[PDB]
Amino acid sequence: MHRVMGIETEYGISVPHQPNANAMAASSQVVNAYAPANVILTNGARLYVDHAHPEYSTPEVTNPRDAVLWDKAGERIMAEAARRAADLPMGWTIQLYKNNTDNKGASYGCHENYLMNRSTPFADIVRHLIPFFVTRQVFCGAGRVGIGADGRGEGFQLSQRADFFEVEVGLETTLKRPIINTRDEPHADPEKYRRLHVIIGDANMSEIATYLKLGTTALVLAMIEDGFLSQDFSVESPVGALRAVSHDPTLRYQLRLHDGRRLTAVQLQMEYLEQARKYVEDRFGTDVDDMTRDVLDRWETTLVRLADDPMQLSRDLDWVAKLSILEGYRQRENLPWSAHKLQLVDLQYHDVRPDRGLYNRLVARGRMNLLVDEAAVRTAMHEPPNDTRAYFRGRCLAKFGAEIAAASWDSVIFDLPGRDSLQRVPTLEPLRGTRAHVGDLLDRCRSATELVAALT
Numbered sequence: 001m002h003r004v005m006g007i008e009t010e011y012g013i014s015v016p017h018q019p020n021a022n023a024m025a026a027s028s029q030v031v032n033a034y035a036p037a038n039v040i041l042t043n044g045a046r047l048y049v050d051h052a053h054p055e056y057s058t059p060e061v062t063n064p065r066d067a068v069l070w071d072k073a074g075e076r077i078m079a080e081a082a083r084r085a086a087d088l089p090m091g092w093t094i095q096l097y098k099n100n101t102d103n104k105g106a107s108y109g110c111h112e113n114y115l116m117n118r119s120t121p122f123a124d125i126v127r128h129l130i131p132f133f134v135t136r137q138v139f140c141g142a143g144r145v146g147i148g149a150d151g152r153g154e155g156f157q158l159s160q161r162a163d164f165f166e167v168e169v170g171l172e173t174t175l176k177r178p179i180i181n182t183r184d185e186p187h188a189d190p191e192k193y194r195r196l197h198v199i200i201g202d203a204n205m206s207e208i209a210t211y212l213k214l215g216t217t218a219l220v221l222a223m224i225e226d227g228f229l230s231q232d233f234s235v236e237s238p239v240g241a242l243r244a245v246s247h248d249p250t251l252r253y254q255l256r257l258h259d260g261r262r263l264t265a266v267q268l269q270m271e272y273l274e275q276a277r278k279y280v281e282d283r284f285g286t287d288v289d290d291m292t293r294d295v296l297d298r299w300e301t302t303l304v305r306l307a308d309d310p311m312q313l314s315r316d317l318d319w320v321a322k323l324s325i326l327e328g329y330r331q332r333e334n335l336p337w338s339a340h341k342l343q344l345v346d347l348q349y350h351d352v353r354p355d356r357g358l359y360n361r362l363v364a365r366g367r368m369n370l371l372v373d374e375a376a377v378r379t380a381m382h383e384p385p386n387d388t389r390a391y392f393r394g395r396c397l398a399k400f401g402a403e404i405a406a407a408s409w410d411s412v413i414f415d416l417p418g419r420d421s422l423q424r425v426p427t428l429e430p431l432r433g434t435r436a437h438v439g440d441l442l443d444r445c446r447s448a449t450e451l452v453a454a455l456t
Protein backbone atom coordinates (compact mmCIF):
# COMPACT_ATOMS: atom_id res chain seq x y z
CA MET A 1 0.00 0.00 0.00
CA HIS A 2 1.00 3.66 -0.36
CA ARG A 3 0.50 6.45 2.17
CA VAL A 4 3.03 9.06 3.26
CA MET A 5 3.42 8.60 6.96
CA GLY A 6 5.88 8.86 9.81
CA ILE A 7 6.18 7.87 13.44
CA GLU A 8 7.68 10.28 15.94
CA THR A 9 8.25 8.53 19.24
CA GLU A 10 9.11 10.50 22.36
CA TYR A 11 11.23 8.05 24.30
CA GLY A 12 10.77 7.81 28.04
CA ILE A 13 14.03 8.83 29.65
CA SER A 14 15.30 8.14 33.16
CA VAL A 15 18.60 8.63 34.93
CA PRO A 16 19.21 6.02 37.65
CA HIS A 17 20.35 7.58 40.93
CA GLN A 18 20.03 11.08 39.49
CA PRO A 19 17.28 13.11 41.22
CA ASN A 20 19.24 16.22 40.23
CA ALA A 21 19.34 15.28 36.54
CA ASN A 22 17.05 17.26 34.22
CA ALA A 23 14.96 15.55 31.54
CA MET A 24 15.80 18.28 29.04
CA ALA A 25 19.48 17.72 29.83
CA ALA A 26 19.46 13.92 29.89
CA SER A 27 17.28 13.98 26.78
CA SER A 28 19.81 16.27 25.14
CA GLN A 29 22.89 14.35 26.26
CA VAL A 30 21.59 11.25 24.51
CA VAL A 31 20.63 13.09 21.31
CA ASN A 32 24.07 14.71 21.36
CA ALA A 33 25.72 11.36 22.04
CA TYR A 34 24.46 10.05 18.70
CA ALA A 35 25.43 13.25 16.86
CA PRO A 36 28.89 11.94 15.86
CA ALA A 37 19.36 19.71 20.17
CA ASN A 38 17.87 18.92 16.76
CA VAL A 39 19.84 16.37 14.74
CA ILE A 40 18.83 15.02 11.33
CA LEU A 41 20.13 11.49 10.74
CA THR A 42 21.65 10.07 7.54
CA ASN A 43 18.55 7.94 7.94
CA GLY A 44 16.32 10.86 7.03
CA ALA A 45 15.17 10.31 10.61
CA ARG A 46 15.10 13.12 13.15
CA LEU A 47 16.67 13.09 16.62
CA TYR A 48 15.74 15.95 18.93
CA VAL A 49 14.58 16.89 22.42
CA ASP A 50 10.83 17.47 22.62
CA HIS A 51 8.95 18.12 25.87
CA ALA A 52 12.10 17.20 27.79
CA HIS A 53 12.07 13.78 26.10
CA PRO A 54 14.48 12.43 23.52
CA GLU A 55 12.45 12.09 20.32
CA TYR A 56 12.94 9.99 17.21
CA SER A 57 11.07 10.94 14.06
CA THR A 58 11.30 8.34 11.32
CA PRO A 59 12.05 9.47 7.79
CA GLU A 60 8.90 9.81 5.69
CA VAL A 61 7.76 6.35 4.60
CA THR A 62 5.11 5.28 2.11
CA ASN A 63 3.97 2.16 3.95
CA PRO A 64 3.29 0.81 7.46
CA ARG A 65 6.06 -1.76 7.01
CA ASP A 66 8.85 0.72 6.36
CA ALA A 67 7.39 2.90 9.10
CA VAL A 68 7.78 -0.12 11.36
CA LEU A 69 11.32 -0.61 10.04
CA TRP A 70 12.52 2.96 10.60
CA ASP A 71 10.71 3.28 13.91
CA LYS A 72 12.40 0.11 15.11
CA ALA A 73 15.61 1.57 13.74
CA GLY A 74 14.92 4.50 16.05
CA GLU A 75 14.92 2.14 19.02
CA ARG A 76 18.35 0.82 18.08
CA ILE A 77 19.42 4.42 17.59
CA MET A 78 18.05 5.39 21.01
CA ALA A 79 19.75 2.46 22.70
CA GLU A 80 23.04 3.26 20.99
CA ALA A 81 22.70 6.95 21.83
CA ALA A 82 22.04 6.18 25.50
CA ARG A 83 25.10 3.91 25.63
CA ARG A 84 27.33 6.56 24.09
CA ALA A 85 26.03 9.08 26.62
CA ALA A 86 27.60 6.87 29.29
CA ASP A 87 30.83 6.73 27.27
CA LEU A 88 30.96 10.54 27.14
CA PRO A 89 33.05 12.43 29.72
CA MET A 90 29.74 13.21 31.42
CA GLY A 91 29.04 10.06 33.42
CA TRP A 92 25.27 9.86 32.94
CA THR A 93 23.82 6.39 32.38
CA ILE A 94 20.51 7.02 30.64
CA GLN A 95 17.66 4.54 30.54
CA LEU A 96 15.37 4.88 27.53
CA TYR A 97 11.93 3.31 27.30
CA LYS A 98 9.70 3.33 24.26
CA ASN A 99 6.50 3.95 26.18
CA ASN A 100 3.86 6.59 26.70
CA THR A 101 4.08 7.05 30.48
CA ASP A 102 6.50 7.03 33.42
CA ASN A 103 3.66 5.84 35.68
CA LYS A 104 4.38 8.95 37.71
CA GLY A 105 1.48 10.74 36.04
CA ALA A 106 3.48 12.02 33.08
CA SER A 107 2.55 11.06 29.52
CA TYR A 108 4.66 11.53 26.38
CA GLY A 109 3.18 10.64 23.01
CA CYS A 110 4.16 8.45 20.10
CA HIS A 111 2.93 10.54 17.20
CA GLU A 112 1.82 9.16 13.85
CA ASN A 113 1.77 11.52 10.88
CA TYR A 114 -0.21 10.80 7.73
CA LEU A 115 -0.35 12.66 4.44
CA MET A 116 -3.94 13.33 3.43
CA ASN A 117 -5.62 15.30 0.69
CA ARG A 118 -6.10 18.84 1.93
CA SER A 119 -9.45 18.61 0.13
CA THR A 120 -10.60 15.99 2.64
CA PRO A 121 -13.09 17.70 4.98
CA PHE A 122 -11.59 17.76 8.47
CA ALA A 123 -15.07 17.13 9.86
CA ASP A 124 -15.27 13.81 8.02
CA ILE A 125 -11.80 12.95 9.30
CA VAL A 126 -12.80 13.66 12.89
CA ARG A 127 -16.13 11.87 12.48
CA HIS A 128 -14.75 8.58 11.19
CA LEU A 129 -11.35 8.85 12.86
CA ILE A 130 -12.51 9.38 16.43
CA PRO A 131 -14.41 6.07 16.73
CA PHE A 132 -11.45 4.36 15.07
CA PHE A 133 -8.77 5.80 17.37
CA VAL A 134 -10.80 5.05 20.47
CA THR A 135 -11.23 1.39 19.57
CA ARG A 136 -7.91 0.68 17.83
CA GLN A 137 -6.10 0.37 21.15
CA VAL A 138 -7.37 -3.21 21.17
CA PHE A 139 -4.39 -4.30 19.06
CA CYS A 140 -2.43 -1.03 19.27
CA GLY A 141 -2.38 -0.68 23.05
CA ALA A 142 1.11 -1.10 24.47
CA GLY A 143 -0.69 -1.95 27.68
CA ARG A 144 -0.35 -0.21 31.01
CA VAL A 145 -0.37 -1.26 34.65
CA GLY A 146 -2.45 1.11 36.74
CA ILE A 147 -5.54 3.09 35.86
CA GLY A 148 -5.95 6.83 35.46
CA ALA A 149 -3.14 9.25 34.70
CA ASP A 150 -1.67 8.89 38.20
CA GLY A 151 -1.44 5.13 37.75
CA ARG A 152 -2.43 4.66 41.38
CA GLY A 153 -5.63 3.04 40.14
CA GLU A 154 -5.26 -0.71 40.53
CA GLY A 155 -5.69 -2.55 37.24
CA PHE A 156 -4.35 -3.29 33.78
CA GLN A 157 -5.38 -1.41 30.67
CA LEU A 158 -4.80 -1.64 26.93
CA SER A 159 -3.69 1.93 26.31
CA GLN A 160 -0.90 3.81 28.01
CA ARG A 161 -2.12 7.10 26.53
CA ALA A 162 -5.86 6.58 27.04
CA ASP A 163 -6.11 8.20 30.46
CA PHE A 164 -4.29 11.31 29.27
CA PHE A 165 -6.87 12.58 26.75
CA GLU A 166 -9.62 14.89 28.04
CA VAL A 167 -10.83 16.34 24.73
CA GLU A 168 -11.82 14.72 21.43
CA VAL A 169 -10.84 17.49 19.00
CA GLY A 170 -8.47 20.44 19.29
CA LEU A 171 -4.86 21.57 19.28
CA GLU A 172 -2.44 19.60 21.44
CA THR A 173 -1.37 21.66 24.43
CA THR A 174 0.35 20.91 27.73
CA LEU A 175 -2.94 21.21 29.60
CA LYS A 176 -5.30 19.38 27.23
CA ARG A 177 -4.64 16.32 25.07
CA PRO A 178 -7.09 15.89 22.13
CA ILE A 179 -7.96 12.57 20.47
CA ILE A 180 -7.94 14.30 17.10
CA ASN A 181 -5.17 16.89 16.96
CA THR A 182 -6.00 20.01 14.97
CA ARG A 183 -2.39 20.97 14.25
CA ASP A 184 -1.74 21.10 10.53
CA GLU A 185 1.95 21.31 9.67
CA PRO A 186 2.14 19.48 6.32
CA HIS A 187 5.82 20.17 5.73
CA ALA A 188 4.53 19.61 2.20
CA ASP A 189 2.60 21.76 -0.26
CA PRO A 190 -0.33 22.88 1.94
CA GLU A 191 -2.96 22.94 -0.82
CA LYS A 192 -2.07 19.42 -1.96
CA TYR A 193 -1.33 17.74 1.38
CA ARG A 194 -2.66 17.78 4.93
CA ARG A 195 -0.50 16.12 7.56
CA LEU A 196 -2.74 14.31 10.01
CA HIS A 197 -1.07 14.39 13.41
CA VAL A 198 -2.17 11.37 15.43
CA ILE A 199 -1.21 11.72 19.09
CA ILE A 200 -3.46 9.09 20.61
CA GLY A 201 -1.35 6.04 19.86
CA ASP A 202 0.88 4.18 22.29
CA ALA A 203 4.45 3.67 21.21
CA ASN A 204 4.53 0.00 20.30
CA MET A 205 7.47 -2.33 20.73
CA SER A 206 5.81 -5.07 18.70
CA GLU A 207 6.48 -4.60 14.99
CA ILE A 208 3.07 -6.08 14.19
CA ALA A 209 1.21 -3.66 16.45
CA THR A 210 2.95 -0.69 14.82
CA TYR A 211 2.28 -2.22 11.40
CA LEU A 212 -1.43 -2.56 12.23
CA LYS A 213 -1.57 0.83 13.94
CA LEU A 214 -0.18 2.60 10.87
CA GLY A 215 -1.71 0.21 8.34
CA THR A 216 -5.29 0.06 9.59
CA THR A 217 -5.27 3.82 10.14
CA ALA A 218 -3.87 4.34 6.65
CA LEU A 219 -6.71 2.18 5.37
CA VAL A 220 -9.32 4.15 7.32
CA LEU A 221 -7.76 7.40 6.06
CA ALA A 222 -8.18 6.17 2.49
CA MET A 223 -11.90 5.51 2.98
CA ILE A 224 -12.22 8.96 4.51
CA GLU A 225 -10.46 10.58 1.57
CA ASP A 226 -12.73 8.79 -0.90
CA GLY A 227 -15.74 9.53 1.29
CA PHE A 228 -16.40 5.80 1.26
CA LEU A 229 -17.93 5.46 4.71
CA SER A 230 -21.71 5.71 4.44
CA GLN A 231 -22.54 5.22 8.11
CA ASP A 232 -21.57 7.14 11.21
CA PHE A 233 -19.37 5.31 13.70
CA SER A 234 -19.28 8.35 15.98
CA VAL A 235 -19.48 7.43 19.67
CA GLU A 236 -21.05 9.39 22.51
CA SER A 237 -18.40 10.36 25.07
CA PRO A 238 -15.61 9.14 22.75
CA VAL A 239 -13.00 10.36 25.22
CA GLY A 240 -14.78 8.41 27.96
CA ALA A 241 -15.32 5.39 25.74
CA LEU A 242 -11.64 5.67 24.90
CA ARG A 243 -10.61 5.23 28.52
CA ALA A 244 -13.41 2.70 29.03
CA VAL A 245 -12.03 0.43 26.32
CA SER A 246 -8.50 0.81 27.69
CA HIS A 247 -9.77 0.15 31.21
CA ASP A 248 -11.31 -3.14 30.12
CA PRO A 249 -8.62 -5.63 29.04
CA THR A 250 -11.42 -8.14 28.45
CA LEU A 251 -12.82 -5.98 25.65
CA ARG A 252 -16.28 -6.97 26.81
CA TYR A 253 -17.43 -3.37 27.22
CA GLN A 254 -19.46 -2.02 24.32
CA LEU A 255 -19.36 1.58 23.15
CA ARG A 256 -22.60 3.50 22.76
CA LEU A 257 -23.11 4.93 19.27
CA HIS A 258 -25.05 8.04 18.24
CA ASP A 259 -27.10 5.62 16.13
CA GLY A 260 -27.87 3.85 19.41
CA ARG A 261 -26.22 0.55 18.51
CA ARG A 262 -23.85 -0.91 21.12
CA LEU A 263 -20.51 -2.36 20.03
CA THR A 264 -17.28 -3.43 21.70
CA ALA A 265 -14.02 -1.82 20.61
CA VAL A 266 -13.20 -4.95 18.61
CA GLN A 267 -16.64 -5.14 16.99
CA LEU A 268 -16.35 -1.49 15.96
CA GLN A 269 -12.89 -2.23 14.56
CA MET A 270 -14.48 -5.10 12.64
CA GLU A 271 -17.02 -2.63 11.26
CA TYR A 272 -14.14 -0.48 10.02
CA LEU A 273 -12.45 -3.65 8.78
CA GLU A 274 -15.21 -5.05 6.58
CA GLN A 275 -15.84 -1.48 5.45
CA ALA A 276 -12.13 -1.33 4.64
CA ARG A 277 -12.29 -4.62 2.76
CA LYS A 278 -15.47 -3.45 1.04
CA TYR A 279 -13.58 -0.26 0.09
CA VAL A 280 -10.42 -1.86 -1.24
CA GLU A 281 -12.40 -4.44 -3.21
CA ASP A 282 -14.47 -1.69 -4.84
CA ARG A 283 -11.43 0.38 -5.78
CA PHE A 284 -8.37 -1.91 -5.94
CA GLY A 285 -10.20 -5.05 -7.08
CA THR A 286 -7.58 -7.61 -8.14
CA ASP A 287 -4.71 -5.08 -8.30
CA VAL A 288 -4.78 -4.76 -4.49
CA ASP A 289 -1.29 -4.69 -2.97
CA ASP A 290 0.05 -7.66 -1.02
CA MET A 291 0.69 -5.27 1.86
CA THR A 292 -2.84 -3.83 1.70
CA ARG A 293 -4.31 -7.34 1.97
CA ASP A 294 -1.70 -8.25 4.58
CA VAL A 295 -2.76 -5.31 6.74
CA LEU A 296 -6.32 -6.34 5.90
CA ASP A 297 -5.97 -9.97 6.97
CA ARG A 298 -3.74 -9.15 9.92
CA TRP A 299 -6.40 -6.64 10.97
CA GLU A 300 -9.19 -9.19 10.54
CA THR A 301 -7.26 -12.07 12.08
CA THR A 302 -6.30 -9.94 15.06
CA LEU A 303 -9.87 -8.80 15.67
CA VAL A 304 -11.13 -12.37 15.36
CA ARG A 305 -8.26 -13.69 17.49
CA LEU A 306 -8.97 -10.88 19.98
CA ALA A 307 -12.67 -11.77 20.14
CA ASP A 308 -12.01 -15.46 20.79
CA ASP A 309 -9.00 -14.98 23.04
CA PRO A 310 -6.76 -11.94 23.54
CA MET A 311 -3.81 -14.05 24.74
CA GLN A 312 -3.39 -16.01 21.51
CA LEU A 313 -2.13 -12.70 20.12
CA SER A 314 0.57 -12.55 22.81
CA ARG A 315 3.22 -12.87 20.09
CA ASP A 316 1.66 -10.13 17.94
CA LEU A 317 0.43 -7.44 20.36
CA ASP A 318 2.23 -5.42 23.02
CA TRP A 319 -0.62 -5.23 25.54
CA VAL A 320 -1.22 -8.97 25.18
CA ALA A 321 2.50 -9.75 25.16
CA LYS A 322 3.05 -7.57 28.22
CA LEU A 323 -0.11 -8.94 29.82
CA SER A 324 1.41 -12.38 29.33
CA ILE A 325 4.55 -11.29 31.18
CA LEU A 326 2.40 -9.57 33.82
CA GLU A 327 -0.11 -12.36 34.43
CA GLY A 328 2.87 -14.67 34.81
CA TYR A 329 4.36 -12.64 37.64
CA ARG A 330 0.93 -12.39 39.26
CA GLN A 331 0.25 -16.13 39.15
CA ARG A 332 3.80 -16.95 40.23
CA GLU A 333 4.13 -14.33 42.99
CA ASN A 334 0.39 -13.80 43.69
CA LEU A 335 0.57 -10.05 43.08
CA PRO A 336 -2.39 -7.67 42.83
CA TRP A 337 -2.24 -5.21 39.93
CA SER A 338 -1.36 -2.68 42.63
CA ALA A 339 2.00 -4.42 42.96
CA HIS A 340 4.82 -1.99 42.21
CA LYS A 341 6.78 -4.81 40.58
CA LEU A 342 4.10 -5.04 37.89
CA GLN A 343 4.73 -1.39 36.99
CA LEU A 344 8.48 -1.95 36.80
CA VAL A 345 7.77 -4.92 34.55
CA ASP A 346 5.37 -2.79 32.52
CA LEU A 347 8.09 -0.17 32.17
CA GLN A 348 10.89 -2.66 31.56
CA TYR A 349 8.95 -4.16 28.66
CA HIS A 350 9.61 -0.92 26.80
CA ASP A 351 13.26 -0.67 27.86
CA VAL A 352 15.33 -0.02 24.72
CA ARG A 353 18.23 -2.07 26.07
CA PRO A 354 18.47 -5.37 24.16
CA ASP A 355 19.25 -7.38 27.29
CA ARG A 356 17.06 -5.49 29.75
CA GLY A 357 14.08 -4.87 27.47
CA LEU A 358 11.37 -7.45 28.09
CA TYR A 359 10.00 -7.11 24.56
CA ASN A 360 13.59 -7.46 23.35
CA ARG A 361 14.04 -10.72 25.26
CA LEU A 362 10.76 -12.02 23.89
CA VAL A 363 12.23 -11.31 20.46
CA ALA A 364 15.49 -13.05 21.40
CA ARG A 365 13.54 -15.86 23.04
CA GLY A 366 11.48 -16.04 19.86
CA ARG A 367 8.38 -15.02 21.81
CA MET A 368 7.40 -12.22 19.43
CA ASN A 369 6.43 -12.13 15.78
CA LEU A 370 8.68 -9.77 13.84
CA LEU A 371 7.47 -8.09 10.65
CA VAL A 372 11.02 -7.06 9.75
CA ASP A 373 14.59 -8.32 10.09
CA GLU A 374 17.21 -6.89 12.44
CA ALA A 375 19.56 -6.73 9.45
CA ALA A 376 17.20 -4.30 7.75
CA VAL A 377 16.61 -2.46 11.03
CA ARG A 378 20.35 -1.90 11.31
CA THR A 379 20.55 -0.67 7.72
CA ALA A 380 17.50 1.49 8.34
CA MET A 381 19.59 3.27 10.96
CA HIS A 382 22.08 4.82 8.52
CA GLU A 383 19.99 4.25 5.38
CA PRO A 384 16.84 6.24 4.48
CA PRO A 385 13.74 5.21 2.49
CA ASN A 386 14.22 5.21 -1.28
CA ASP A 387 10.60 6.04 -2.04
CA THR A 388 10.52 9.30 -0.08
CA ARG A 389 12.28 12.67 0.04
CA ALA A 390 13.92 11.25 3.17
CA TYR A 391 16.34 9.70 0.68
CA PHE A 392 17.53 13.09 -0.52
CA ARG A 393 17.67 14.44 3.03
CA GLY A 394 19.36 11.33 4.39
CA ARG A 395 21.92 10.87 1.64
CA CYS A 396 22.77 14.58 1.70
CA LEU A 397 23.63 14.54 5.40
CA ALA A 398 25.71 11.41 4.87
CA LYS A 399 27.74 12.67 1.88
CA PHE A 400 27.25 16.45 2.09
CA GLY A 401 26.56 16.71 5.82
CA ALA A 402 29.79 18.64 6.30
CA GLU A 403 28.67 21.33 3.85
CA ILE A 404 25.13 21.35 5.27
CA ALA A 405 24.35 24.10 7.78
CA ALA A 406 20.85 22.87 8.58
CA ALA A 407 18.30 20.27 7.47
CA SER A 408 14.62 19.54 8.09
CA TRP A 409 11.58 17.93 6.47
CA ASP A 410 11.01 21.17 4.57
CA SER A 411 14.51 21.64 3.16
CA VAL A 412 18.25 21.10 3.35
CA ILE A 413 20.23 24.30 3.79
CA PHE A 414 23.72 23.96 2.35
CA ASP A 415 26.60 26.33 2.93
CA LEU A 416 28.72 26.52 -0.19
CA PRO A 417 32.23 27.90 0.28
CA GLY A 418 32.33 31.15 -1.70
CA ARG A 419 28.62 31.87 -1.32
CA ASP A 420 27.85 34.46 1.37
CA SER A 421 24.24 33.29 1.54
CA LEU A 422 23.02 29.87 2.65
CA GLN A 423 21.55 27.84 -0.19
CA ARG A 424 18.19 26.26 0.65
CA VAL A 425 16.80 23.38 -1.39
CA PRO A 426 13.32 22.83 0.05
CA THR A 427 11.95 19.36 0.07
CA LEU A 428 8.31 20.34 -0.17
CA GLU A 429 7.31 17.20 -2.01
CA PRO A 430 7.61 14.15 0.28
CA LEU A 431 7.30 11.92 -2.78
CA ARG A 432 10.03 13.77 -4.68
CA GLY A 433 13.74 13.69 -3.89
CA THR A 434 13.56 9.89 -3.84
CA ARG A 435 16.12 7.31 -4.96
CA ALA A 436 14.74 7.58 -8.47
CA HIS A 437 14.66 11.37 -8.62
CA VAL A 438 17.89 12.36 -6.88
CA GLY A 439 19.58 8.97 -6.65
CA ASP A 440 21.95 9.30 -9.61
CA LEU A 441 22.48 13.00 -8.97
CA LEU A 442 23.62 12.29 -5.41
CA ASP A 443 25.98 9.59 -6.66
CA ARG A 444 27.57 11.81 -9.30
CA CYS A 445 27.86 15.06 -7.34
CA ARG A 446 31.38 15.43 -5.94
CA SER A 447 30.46 18.39 -3.74
CA ALA A 448 27.48 20.22 -2.25
CA THR A 449 28.20 23.28 -4.38
CA GLU A 450 28.10 20.89 -7.32
CA LEU A 451 24.86 19.40 -6.01
CA VAL A 452 23.24 22.78 -5.43
CA ALA A 453 24.24 23.72 -8.98
CA ALA A 454 22.59 20.62 -10.43
CA LEU A 455 19.36 21.35 -8.55
CA THR A 456 19.43 25.01 -9.57
Ligand SMILES: Nc1ncnc2c1ncn2[C@@H]1O[C@H](COP(=O)(O)OP(=O)(O)OP(=O)(O)O)[C@@H](O)[C@H]1O
Binds near residue numbers: 006046059111188193
Ligand atom coordinates in the same frame (compact mmCIF):
# COMPACT_ATOMS: atom_id res chain seq x y z
N1 LIG B 1 4.39 15.40 4.97
C1 LIG B 1 4.37 14.47 5.95
N2 LIG B 1 3.41 13.52 5.99
C2 LIG B 1 3.36 12.58 6.96
N3 LIG B 1 4.27 12.51 7.95
C3 LIG B 1 5.29 13.40 8.03
C4 LIG B 1 5.40 14.45 7.02
N4 LIG B 1 6.48 15.18 7.33
C5 LIG B 1 7.03 14.65 8.46
N5 LIG B 1 6.31 13.58 8.87
C6 LIG B 1 6.59 12.76 10.06
O1 LIG B 1 6.60 13.59 11.22
C7 LIG B 1 7.68 13.24 12.09
C8 LIG B 1 8.43 14.51 12.49
O2 LIG B 1 7.67 15.16 13.49
P1 LIG B 1 8.33 16.20 14.53
O3 LIG B 1 9.06 15.42 15.60
O4 LIG B 1 9.06 17.25 13.73
O5 LIG B 1 7.03 16.84 15.22
P2 LIG B 1 6.22 18.08 14.59
O6 LIG B 1 5.33 17.50 13.52
O7 LIG B 1 7.18 19.19 14.24
O8 LIG B 1 5.30 18.53 15.83
P3 LIG B 1 5.87 18.52 17.34
O9 LIG B 1 7.25 19.11 17.24
O10 LIG B 1 4.89 19.38 18.10
O11 LIG B 1 5.83 17.05 17.73
C9 LIG B 1 8.57 12.25 11.35
O12 LIG B 1 8.57 11.02 12.07
C10 LIG B 1 7.96 12.09 9.97
O13 LIG B 1 7.79 10.73 9.58
Ligand SMILES: [Mg+2]
Binds near residue numbers: 008050055057111
Ligand atom coordinates in the same frame (compact mmCIF):
# COMPACT_ATOMS: atom_id res chain seq x y z
MG1 LIG C 1 7.86 15.09 17.16
Ligand SMILES: [Mg+2]
Binds near residue numbers: 008111
Ligand atom coordinates in the same frame (compact mmCIF):
# COMPACT_ATOMS: atom_id res chain seq x y z
MG1 LIG D 1 4.80 15.36 17.12
